[PDB]
Amino acid sequence: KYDVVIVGSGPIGCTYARELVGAGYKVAMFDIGEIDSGLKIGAHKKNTVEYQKNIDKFVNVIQGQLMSVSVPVNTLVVDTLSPTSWQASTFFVRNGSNPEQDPLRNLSGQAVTRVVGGMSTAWTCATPRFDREQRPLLVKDDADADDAEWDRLYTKAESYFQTGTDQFKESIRHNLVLNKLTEEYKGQRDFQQIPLAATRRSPTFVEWSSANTVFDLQNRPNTDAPEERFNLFPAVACERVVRNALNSEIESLHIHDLISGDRFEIKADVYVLTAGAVHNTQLLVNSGFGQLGRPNPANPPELLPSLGSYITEQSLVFCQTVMSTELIDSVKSDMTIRGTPGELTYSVTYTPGASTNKHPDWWNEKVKNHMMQHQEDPLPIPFEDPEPQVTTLFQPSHPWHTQIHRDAFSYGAVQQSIDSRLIVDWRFFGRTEPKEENKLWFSDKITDAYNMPQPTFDFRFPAGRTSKEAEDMMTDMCVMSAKIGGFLPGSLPQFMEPGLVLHLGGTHRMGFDEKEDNCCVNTDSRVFGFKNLFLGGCGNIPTAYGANPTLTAMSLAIKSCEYIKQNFTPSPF
């Protein structure tokens, strides 16, 4: 028996933990996955010296933990088996595939992670705020009050994640790209550092934030927090919340301990679901909310008829570029270079402080030292120079988020032919209109690896604005990137597999009125009709958004915790 139970130990469940453990509630958190970021529980797995010295390897860590949500039945023809090998006569259900899934209306890229810390063990840490156009209303009829409220929540969310915009400020590659784009779009678009949840520890190491940053996940009481109460239970699959007969309260949470095999009913005052956008929905549907099985408009749901409808997933376009000769020459614009490289006669110098210098003293010093210590190298950029981290944020005239950077989540084989210092990634992210026909549903027959109802997508990017902006977005990437360099062969401009972006929202969407706003939670993230059931995560977000959604889901979780503090009293210690 606990005051609060939280399903999921991602960054959003950790937000609930930090708020509610902090205010003195007795909290239990269950996660279906296990501890594997080392001694700091739920921490970013990229925070090893080894991964940051070998960053091209990290993509493997991400791929290891990302399990595809719905894989349609495979129909690839293999007709060169030996005549002695066993072969089927049909494309039968094999290898975990989902026979419910139409392969042409899928988010083939969508995937889920089952580990303590969730996806924040592996994420890219981009945490931009949404502007009003992308953002749901928390107060209607008063835009200054709405703005004030979001600014308060976002500022709080940013302190939890340690969000900042200074961590790449002395990178030459970063500044080279930032300044070129600033100049080229002067007075049309503004560029800045991607806001990133991260603290720099040294010139060659960044401590990336994670769920662990929000809440350390240590059991309490402990020496540092002797008046607090928290228990984390990993390797526990939460399966159902049990409703009372009147559908006004949750009575227990049914769990299955994956190590012992035991099953229990846990009791709490407050039930918080933060299992991610796909798995929150699964749990809810397995508990008799919305509709199990293939959508049947003729058999309309008892509860939450909008559950798993109006799903949004962003369009994503991507390429990489190889830095222009002109930009590479400009790196060394302030330098005087004499003699020939590799001889005793060679010299590279600059005038410190000269207001005609195109670059600051710290840049010139690093170029100089590099050119002088590595005279065999043809490039002026230092070998350990950090990557670019540049964005121009969503605006009505360019309604897409942009990242101009180097991501550890590369999408094709890492090429080795072109020097890494030259390469920039471009990712532009489009917003998707919520439409009732776009659905996440759960089979009544097929089950997944944890014996829960199999997720199935029925999705296409909506015609009209969504698709028009997607293609405009592609053009914009092509136009903008060319200012920096030509496309890298093997990473030519393309749309990524639907869902690979992992910014799925709207599966259990928020709104003011259940019927009028076709939604499932109110602005306290409380499930309509239920006193004591709260959902957290990107599945709450009901709008078309282009920016990375995590900071916004966190802000909503902060507001939700405010309601919980006003309505439930912690038990005596």
Ligand X SMILES: Cc1cc2nc3c(=O)[nH]c(=O)nc-3n(C[C@H](O)[C@H](O)[C@H](O)COP(=O)(O)OP(=O)(O)OC[C@H]3O[C@@H](n4cnc5c(N)ncnc54)[C@H](O)[C@@H]3O)c2cc1C
Ligand Y SMILES: OC[C@H]1O[C@@H](O)[C@H](F)[C@@H](O)[C@H]1O
- 409 binds ligand X per the rule CB under 6 A: yes
Q: Given candidates 119, 176, 181, 304, which one binds ligand X under the rule CB under 6 A?
A: 119
User: How far is Cα 1 from Cα 7, in angstroms, rounded to an integer?
Assistant: 15
**548 is known as an active-site residue:** yes
CB of 493 to ligand Y, least distance (A): 16
Identify the bridge partners of residue 402 per DSSP, sorted by sequence position.
Answer: 428
User: Nearest to residue 320, comparing CAs of 429, 208, 403, 204?
Assistant: 403
Q: Given candidates 367, 502, 520, 535, which one binds ligand Y under the rule CB under 6 A?
A: 502
Nearer to a second copy, 83 or 353 (CB): 83
Identify the bridge partners of residue 266 per DSSP, sorted by sequence position.
Answer: 253
Binders of ligand X among 258-297, rule CB under 6 A?
A: 274-276, 279, 283
328 binds, among a second copy, ligand X, ligand Y, none (CB under 5 to 8 A by kind): a second copy
Which residues touch 280 (CB under 8 Å, ≥6 apart)?
A: 8, 273, 274, 507, 508, 535, 537, 539
Residue 560 and residue 536 in contact, taking contact as beta carbons nearer than 8 Å: yes
CA dihedral (28, 34, 39, 40) positive or negative: negative
403 binds, among a second copy, ligand Y, ligand X, none (CB under 5 to 8 A by kind): ligand Y
User: How far is Cα 241 from Cα 253, in angstroms, rounded to an integer?
Assistant: 5
401 binds, among a second copy, ligand X, ligand Y, none (CB under 5 to 8 A by kind): none
Please identify, among the stretches 84-92, 216-224, 370-378, 401-409, the one whose residues bind ligand Y according to the rule CB under 6 A.
401-409
CB of 62 to ligand X, least distance (A): 5
Indicate the residue type of 390: V
30 binds, among ligand Y, a second copy, ligand X, none (CB under 5 to 8 A by kind): ligand X
CA 130 to chain centre: 14
Nearer to ligand X, 366 or 405 (CB): 405
Please identify, among the stretches 322-330, 402-410, 453-461, 481-489, the one whose residues bind ligand Y according to the rule CB under 6 A.
402-410
34 binds, among a second copy, ligand Y, ligand X, none (CB under 5 to 8 A by kind): a second copy
Binders of ligand Y among 413-472, rule CB under 6 A?
A: 427
Q: Given candidates 501, 510, 533, 544, which one binds ligand Y under the rule CB under 6 A?
A: 501
Binders of ligand X among 499-558, rule CB under 6 A?
A: 502, 537-538, 548-550, 553
User: Nearest to residue 126, comparing CAs of 412, 390, 420?
Assistant: 390
How, if at all, do strands 400-405 and 423-430 pair? Answer: antiparallel
Residue 150 and residue 555 in contact, taking contact as beta carbons nearer than 8 Å: yes
Nearer to a second copy, 70 or 281 (CB): 70
Q: Given candidates 108, 110, 120, 167, which one binds ligand X under the rule CB under 6 A?
A: 120
CB of 437 to a second copy, least distance (A): 10
Q: Given candidates 13, 136, 511, 542, which one binds ligand X under the rule CB under 6 A?
A: 13
CB of 362 to a second copy, least distance (A): 20
Which residues touch 18 (CB under 8 Å, ≥6 apart)?
A: 160, 214, 215
Nearer to ligand X, 2 or 123 (CB): 123
CA dihedral (171, 172, 176, 177) positive or negative: negative
User: For residue 527, what is the DSSP state?
Assistant: B
3-class DSSP state of 4: strand
Nearer to ligand X, 48 or 324 (CB): 48
Nearer to ligand X, 7 or 176 (CB): 7
Indicate which residue of 503, 508, 532, 540 is catalytic: 503
- 241 binds ligand X per the rule CB under 6 A: no
CB of 109 to ligand Y, least distance (A): 8
Please give, one letter per residue, the 3-state secondary structure of 95-106.
CCCCCCCCCCCC
How, if at all, do strands 192-193 and 389-391 pair? Answer: antiparallel
User: For residue 566, what is the DSSP state?
Assistant: H
CB of 356 to a second copy, least distance (A): 24
Residue 545 and residue 312 in contact, taking contact as beta carbons nearer than 8 Å: yes
CB of 500 to ligand Y, least distance (A): 5
- 3 binds ligand X per the rule CB under 6 A: no
User: For residue 519, what is the DSSP state?
Assistant: -
Nearer to ligand X, 346 or 409 (CB): 409
User: How far is Cα 255 from Cα 115, in angstroms, rounded to an integer?
Assistant: 17
Burial class (CB in 10 A: 0-12, 13-18, 19+), 177: buried
Please identify, among the stretches 112-120, 136-144, 264-272, 303-311, the one whose residues bind ligand X according to the rule CB under 6 A.
112-120
**175 is known as an active-site residue:** no
How many angstroms separate the most distant Cα atoms in the chain?
89
User: How far is Cα 415 from Cα 470, in angstroms, rounded to an integer?
Assistant: 28
CA 48 to chain centre: 20
Residue 43 and residue 21 in contact, taking contact as beta carbons nearer than 8 Å: no
Q: Given candidates 51, 346, 409, 528, which one binds ligand Y under the rule CB under 6 A?
A: 409
- 403 binds ligand Y per the rule CB under 6 A: yes
Binding site for ligand X (CB under 6 A): 7-13, 30-33, 62, 113-115, 118-120, 122-127, 237-238, 274-276, 279, 283, 409, 502, 537-538, 548-550, 553
Which of the residues are catalytic? 503, 548
Report the interface residues with ligand Y, using CB under 6 A. Answer: 124, 126, 403, 407, 409, 427, 500-502, 548
